[PDB]
Amino acid sequence: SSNTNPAIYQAISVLSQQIHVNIPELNTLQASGGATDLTVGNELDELTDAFTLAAATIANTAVSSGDTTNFPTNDDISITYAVALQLVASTASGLKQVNSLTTYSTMMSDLDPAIAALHVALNRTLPNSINLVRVMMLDAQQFLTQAGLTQSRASLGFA
């Protein structure tokens, strides 16, 4: 009924900032041979927490009438989120091949409902904002499938 895009963008921005910390750390861990159940798990725990917090913040935000002209627009929110989710998806998929891990499926099963809760909260609080996210994920949704992030992928709209 009023515009709550600024509050929605703030939550997505906080989430993206966290993602831009944990994903580069996971990339360096994997490239350097330091990726273990413990070091990967610590990064994925922070990521899962960040998605849970973003979903709760947006769920508690009033439904937005939206804004298509002034920053942050509906598209600014969808694009900022989509770029962060592509980062998460490609790294989550690429970690499956780390032989040291014995907890991969578990880490992803904890992450998946947190991401999906974000998608549901975002698409309900800013109606249909997930649509452009899905478009930007048209190829990267393959990473979600390989990672077993099936609720994440379905809640974007993929069949």
Binding of Ca ion by 72 (CB under 5 A):
no
Distance CA 124, CA 130 (A): 9
Q: Is the dihedral of CA 19, 42, 48, 150 positive or negative?
A: positive
Cβ 102 to Ca ion shortest distance, Å: 12
65 versus 106: smaller Cβ distance to Ca ion: 106
Distance CA 38, CA 45 (A): 10
Q: Which residue is nearest to Ca ion, using beta carbons?
A: 105
Distance CA 151, CA 114 (A): 9
Joined tokens for residue 126: 């800013």
Amino acid at 146: Q
Binding of Ca ion by 105 (CB under 5 A):
yes
Residues 44/98, Cβ–Cβ less than 8 Å: no
Binding of Ca ion by 97 (CB under 5 A):
no
Q: Which stretch binds Ca ion (CB under 5 A): 37-45, 87-95, 115-123, 147-155?
A: 147-155
72 versus 148: smaller Cβ distance to Ca ion: 148
Distance CA 140, CA 153 (A): 10
Q: Which stretch binds Ca ion (CB under 5 A): 11-19, 23-31, 100-108, 121-129?
A: 100-108
Distance CA 73, CA 104 (A): 36
Binding of Ca ion by 106 (CB under 5 A):
no
Cβ 145 to Ca ion shortest distance, Å: 10
Binding of Ca ion by 148 (CB under 5 A):
yes
17 versus 105: smaller Cβ distance to Ca ion: 105
**Residue whose structure tokens are 């990267």:** 140
68 versus 102: smaller Cβ distance to Ca ion: 102
97 versus 105: smaller Cβ distance to Ca ion: 105
Residues of this chain that interact with Ca ion (CB under 5 A) are: 105, 148
